[PDB]
Amino acid sequence: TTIAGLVFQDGVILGADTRATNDSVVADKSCEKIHFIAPKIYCCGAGVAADAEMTTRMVASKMELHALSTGREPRVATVTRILRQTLFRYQGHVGASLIVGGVDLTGPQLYGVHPHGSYSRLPFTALGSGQDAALAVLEDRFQPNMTLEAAQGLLVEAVTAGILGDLGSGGNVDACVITKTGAKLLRTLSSPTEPVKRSGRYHFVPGTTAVLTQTVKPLTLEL
Amino acid sequence: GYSFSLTTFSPSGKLVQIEYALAAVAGGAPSVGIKAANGVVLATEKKQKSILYDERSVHKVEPITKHIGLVYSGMGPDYRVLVHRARKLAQQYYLVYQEPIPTAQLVQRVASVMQEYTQSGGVRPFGVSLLICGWNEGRPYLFQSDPSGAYFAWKATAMGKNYVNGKTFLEKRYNEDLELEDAIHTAILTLKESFEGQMTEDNIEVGICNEAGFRRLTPTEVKDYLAAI
Amino acid sequence: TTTLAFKFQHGVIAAVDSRASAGSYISALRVNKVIEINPYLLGTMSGCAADCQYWERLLAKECRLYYLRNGERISVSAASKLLSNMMCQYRGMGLSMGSMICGWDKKGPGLYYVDEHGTRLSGNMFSTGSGNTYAYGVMDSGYRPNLSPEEAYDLGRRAIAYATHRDSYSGGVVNMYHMKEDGWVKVESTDVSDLLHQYREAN
Amino acid sequence: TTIMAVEFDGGVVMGSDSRVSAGEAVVNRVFDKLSPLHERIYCALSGSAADAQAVADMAAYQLELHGIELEEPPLVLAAANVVRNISYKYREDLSAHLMVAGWDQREGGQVYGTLGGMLTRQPFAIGGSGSTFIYGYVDAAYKPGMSPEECRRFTTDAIALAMSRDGSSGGVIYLVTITAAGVDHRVILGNELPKFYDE
Amino acid sequence: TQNPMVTGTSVLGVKFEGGVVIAADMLGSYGSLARFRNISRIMRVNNSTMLGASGDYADFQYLKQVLGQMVIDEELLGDGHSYSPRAIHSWLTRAMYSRRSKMNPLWNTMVIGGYADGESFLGYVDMLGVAYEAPSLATGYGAYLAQPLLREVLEKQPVLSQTEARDLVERCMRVLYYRDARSYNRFQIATVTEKGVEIEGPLSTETNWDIAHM
Amino acid sequence: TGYDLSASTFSPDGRVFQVEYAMKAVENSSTAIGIRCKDGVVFGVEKLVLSKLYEEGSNKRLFNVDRHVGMAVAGLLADARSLADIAREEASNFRSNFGYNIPLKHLADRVAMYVHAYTLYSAVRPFGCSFMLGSYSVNDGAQLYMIDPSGVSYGYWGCAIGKARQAAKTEIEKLQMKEMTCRDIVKEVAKIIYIVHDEVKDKAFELELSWVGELTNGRHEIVPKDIREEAEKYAKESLK
Amino acid sequence: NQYDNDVTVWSPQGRIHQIEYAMEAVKQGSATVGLKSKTHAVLVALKRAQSELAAHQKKILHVDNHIGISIAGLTADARLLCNFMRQECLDSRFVFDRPLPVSRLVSLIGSKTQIPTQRYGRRPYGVGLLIAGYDDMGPHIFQTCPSANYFDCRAMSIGARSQSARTYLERHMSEFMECNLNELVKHGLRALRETLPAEQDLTTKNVSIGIVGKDLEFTIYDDDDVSPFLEGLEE
Amino acid sequence: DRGVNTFSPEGRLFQVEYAIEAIKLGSTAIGIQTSEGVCLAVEKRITSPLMEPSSIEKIVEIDAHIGCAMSGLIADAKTLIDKARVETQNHWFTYNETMTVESVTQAVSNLALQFGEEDADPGAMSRPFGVALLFGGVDEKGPQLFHMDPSGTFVQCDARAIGSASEGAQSSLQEVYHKSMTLKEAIKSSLIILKQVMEEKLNATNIELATVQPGQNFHMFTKEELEEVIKD
Amino acid sequence: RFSPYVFNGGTILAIAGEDFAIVASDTRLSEGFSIHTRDSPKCYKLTDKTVIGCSGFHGDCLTLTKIIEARLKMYKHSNNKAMTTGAIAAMLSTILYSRRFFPYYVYNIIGGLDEEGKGAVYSFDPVGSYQRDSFKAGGSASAMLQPLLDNQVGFKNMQNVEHVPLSLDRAMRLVKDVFISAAERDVYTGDALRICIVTKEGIREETVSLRKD
């Protein structure tokens, strides 16, 4: 996995690859690693896929309860605090490496949250097995107060460096631009690897499979 | 704690504490619910004792989730308990099934909590009747849940002060094919039957629920509906 | 340790050695490896000395409670079952206790083998302890169900004396009991090396 | 990490490097390891990041409620005890050393070490993986009666010296000066660091 | 404590005619690093009792809190009764044994010195609950260097004066500074007599290095 | 009546009678006084002797709650001793947590909230006790607090609890204690106790004196026998 | 009457009637006397027999080598409170290897017996004790009551007709501190005798004696062992 | 309706007072202590000829040297009898010895005021035991007889009667009891006093008799033995 | 890792005669190859007719000793009599077995008089197994002392020898000789020999010097 984040002029941009590997075998070519927390708070997940899935789901749920009760738009520091304290109690056994990006009454913020419960507020960050490829691209060309198009370009380049450089990363680049007027979920913002077509003419003539038993159960009675 | 029930059967087979809780609801401010063909309206009398009350600080028409909403008649503090519990229950359903809770499922889970308070030790029942609205099967839902823990699906209904008369007005003014905008007009009209004084967009509260989810009407939207009378 | 017990025409014979070892050191030359629960109930002991003494005395207390509660003695099957359940309750804990619960109840002579695993077998011949294989060889060779009391006492004393000669963890004296219809009798407490010298002198 | 705290007449100076590293990987190169426990009480974080942040947060929460019930800002001794108690109660499960320093109306500027749940007041104290290489330096350069500016200079030179020898320390130097007047936060960038022999 | 952190070395103690004297250096080592060269490892318990501790300093500071609070509690009653050196020693044995038996020891070895009802008290307690009385005590590495010298003098003269005991202790601290690699030339000497508990320090021994030319 | 059996029951006029009845037990008890002066706090108790068979010092109504804190009680004595133990444990807990002596206002707030907790339920009854806490610190000065059965805690210059609470109050008001020392105030404390004591009704009594101030080094301790005898002789001679 | 059945209910007069009813249990039981000299603490008791054919109820119990008690009230509550005292004494010798100071044991009784007087459904201990002990502060006579209150006494008497014993003790308390053990026991027996009607007298069947002092561990004298003490006076 | 731990204005727990009253409804039992042994005798109070008298157990064996006679609510006694039997066997297990008659009486007496509502375990005692017990046995102090009531008060007795006609039977015991009397004379006096207070005419089925002597274990008298003693 | 045990040494021995019982021990307390104290006797008086010898890990010796003392008091209060030698032995087996999975590292030998006034010896292993003996050796030198006792007190391996009973005088000299021999060969036995003699009159104590190295 290569997940990255970046703080620009009017917001934050979260980036992620779309590959899920089951120990050197690509299981999913198109998985969503950018999760919703609140309308202006999103989260990239890396680490143990189930732990990242259930921890993001849990905090989005706690944040809906928090927003319903308070009557206010949720704060990025609250989602970090909730995540941190839950992860700390599990002593790293909940393997969720998260990049929390969002916009609140205090502006755009970006955080890296680790499985043990430690965190960091940063202008740019990268997590996952492909984090060093993404981080090299960010260190090489990040400049503060970038325009939306300049920051999106840097983010796509950073996630792409990880996709091509890391065996545990691949597929497409997903992105999420968060600004004061909401979030633009750019699923498949770029596909570094163009359609790998083939002359896959593998048809079987009906009857080539030898059958021993057959039973038909109709359902038209219920319909 | 007191481990014995505070609600018990009388020699005539009545749960007198639930009947007295219903009297608290009957004394409460009016509430109306109307299930239109393409949505649901919830309207309530939000009349305050003085001008000094900051009207926009507390609300009677409350969201439970993105597609479910609530209103009540009776005890305000008891209501808040049920809203917190209903919001919580709707999040538990969402974590498990990854799908917004069907209105009937939420009503059933909240009705169970209300029933507990009629049998559990050292507690009295809630002095609240709820009116829950929702949108889930490409269709609208309106339910009433009373202090005993019993629930009813309604096309239209009234609760609180002058509720028996509100239900008769609704009976003759309700049609299954009414549209949401017309149903908001009808809902305000049912409240106007028992409203004492002049009805402004600050002493009544309206909530709607359609394909786009549940939301409260802003005082500007309530003003535009009151302009029509 | 070497413990043996066998049913015959005239009841049940029960014999034990008396050695206790702390590694290769003989910590006790003469310990009693038989518990007398009541006049109609005996228990032979092998394994961890403290486990044997505590659990068999706990079975004895439970048997005593049964008599006070019912004005009747416990059966050999129920007493062996009680001990077996005590062992099951502590399985995996590292207890070491092999025993034979020998007695006479409403069903005649009874002999049960009970383990620290919870094994509980009824049968008419058993042998436990580090020297059990040597006792089995002798006991099996000279056994007949129709042995006279004196012929049975000779077989018991010989199986234990011969086990003590080959097994370094068995020795001391043979403590033998004869379980009759009217209760057990302690037959003898005989020095095993004197028995072996006597056998040798007859060659 | 290299953390340092110095007592002077009227307050304290605290400094830290800025490197957060997972082995050979620098995960964060600009981390501020000086955290406020109260208005005039700070702690310097070292060891496990998750443990250090957890302890600092619980101590800040405990001290906030303590300060409100007492109708006064907490004593630096109360803050140092609060930290020391958490670190000692959970000594087999926490791997962080939180140095606690600040100002009081009763004792003034004070520096406290809580290493492994112990408690000691020191004229100055150093901690972190980098402190190892500057023990001789702080023993040779420390002088009693230093001014607030002399303490900042000492902390900066010592931390820069450790940052250059220690793989686990680097980045910028963060300084904090706590006095009755308030707190002054200052940053010495990685280009503006004091230079010494480096071959 | 499963793994001690900042630790203190040997604690000495010897009974004399009219009281007890204990000695301990002011070092807290972190492995081989002499990390804290100015910490007191001696504690005044009450007017009759004093305590010195080898082992983990954090565990000693905890015991010092628990012991100090017990003394405050007792003094609130003001009922004519007070913990004897022997009762504090007894409590500390139970406390150490109890922690040992829970597999979470307080990582220390202590020397309790006392003077009550005309009798000198000297007692040892270790992290396992091993306790006893003797005319002289030496914990840690001092059991190998200092105890042979304390015993050599006590063999010739079983009852020493306060000055005789003091010179002997000072000679032991010098031998310990020379031969124990986890010691420091800064120590305290605490004395308990009818007058009470007095802790003196920081002290140093005059070293001699003339063997460097042999 | 009816509405007065449980502390979890309000009467129709907004009162909690079980708490008022607990206060009656304090009013029916002997008088205790506390006076805050320029350099400390002085306590005095009218300790009625119920039997000549008792030892002098028995049934003490002055306690050491911490080394720097003193407590003077009035009311049901077993309840009072139970409250001294709560205050002791509370002061000890503060030292374990923060490493220094509990500030008296904080100790009073903490103890008063245990007292308050016993005024809310049918499961327990309110304390039949009113007590004062006195302390002296260099950073805090002299401090005198008084807690009643309801759970109320206030700071005082002069204070009295028991039978002659109002009688002792008009005598304390006659003192300009803000500019007086502990050594002069002891005489005044013994004198006020002798005035309010009813010789006819409550035959004999033992005067109990405590103090904590600059003189004692901020330690709460008994007023030594000699100073007590001088204040006792002065109290008797002023009575004539 | 409505403020009558619960310890948690204060009456309008600031009284806890349930505590006052528990106090009566002490008054119903037979009289016991406790007194002390500079070296000894003595307990003397009137043992009550339910019939001529029944033995006289044990009034004196052993707590520790340095402490003993005399009871008056519910015997099951006396046994419960005695067992508490014995355990508290055992813990002190286990932890501190030193006898528990008598005044500190009495404080523990006061805290322990106060707890049930403030909780619903709970009741006071229906027993009063006289405690003889000897420690670093010399001999002691302590009194404990169902109210949870406790008293340090020069001498004391509790139980049926005990006011008679208190009148004797108040008169002779000037002599007590200088008495030798026989003179002290004699004074206790004369105080005990005052409670008894003019018809009956102290016999070696209804007399129990408990003694602890500078040279004596707590010892209980009951039938033939009582005879040396009963030869001193004849009404 | 007051609680179970309420005191009366006289200083006694009401529930204990009423449990003593409940014993005045039980069948009468007598115990006599003698230098030759202790005898226990009790009336069975048989309501129907169809009832098996052998199934009415009012004299039980606690241990070989200790016996127990009971009166009052007999189902309540079954719990105390078993707790006494368990204590003897726990004492034997730990100390390898028999208990004294006094220690067994005390062990059962420790359970006496162990009742209550608030601050109790899930299924703790809600009321006292409505039973009176007479323990009779031999130890190192010789033959001993002990009495016990619902209050937990236990005392040694030379002769004691419990039950419905306890007032009348104690009068007869007081006039007939001599300290130096023999076991045969104590057994006969018990049977005479029992015949006197009993509604039915006493026979070998209507009553229960048992002896514990120095040298003899606890012995329950058989019908043949009861008939041979009835003759005098 | 932390080991809750340590070996402190010490040898104990008990002999039961017709009307006496001897319980003896050395007074050395060791750790490693060093001496804690030369005055640590291992005999503990329990009652006027029973003493116990304890050897092994000293933290357990102190603890178990205090537990026995508390238990004797508890029994005297419940039963109104002191525990007999046999009752103490049966109870001690249960206290040791209560720790079957975290044993007390103590070798115990009880010596006193039974209820017939005859001498009684009772020896245990750390987990509670026991029996009554006529004589027994325990502790570091037990293997050295025991075979001599087997020979000289049990008369084993001797032909044509008078089986004369053991007199107190004869037993005292034999305890002195075996502890002199044990101190010569066992590094953990030395300094002094404490001998406790139990008779109807009571308990006498003797202390005899042993090798100091």
Ligand SMILES: *[B]([O])([O])[C]([C]C1=[C]OC2=[C][C]=[C][C]=C12)[N]C(=O)[C]1[C][C]2[C][C][C]1O2
């Ligand atoms: B046998 O299995 O070798 C033997 C059993 C034994 C020894 O002593 C007794 C006493 C009572 C019952 C059984 C018993 N075991 C031993 O020799 C060892 C001595 C002790 C330590 C290991 C084992 O038990």
Ligand SMILES: *[B]([O])([O])[C]([C]C1=[C]OC2=[C][C]=[C][C]=C12)[N]C(=O)[C]1[C][C]2[C][C][C]1O2
């Ligand atoms: B130092 O001792 O090397 C350092 C302290 C540090 C770094 O980042 C933070 C954040 C919050 C508190 C302290 C802190 N430690 C580390 O960098 C380590 C790497 C990772 C594993 C332990 C700790 O965190």
Ligand code: NA
């Ligand atoms: Na570096």
Ligand code: NA
């Ligand atoms: Na030797």
Ligand code: NA
């Ligand atoms: Na040597």
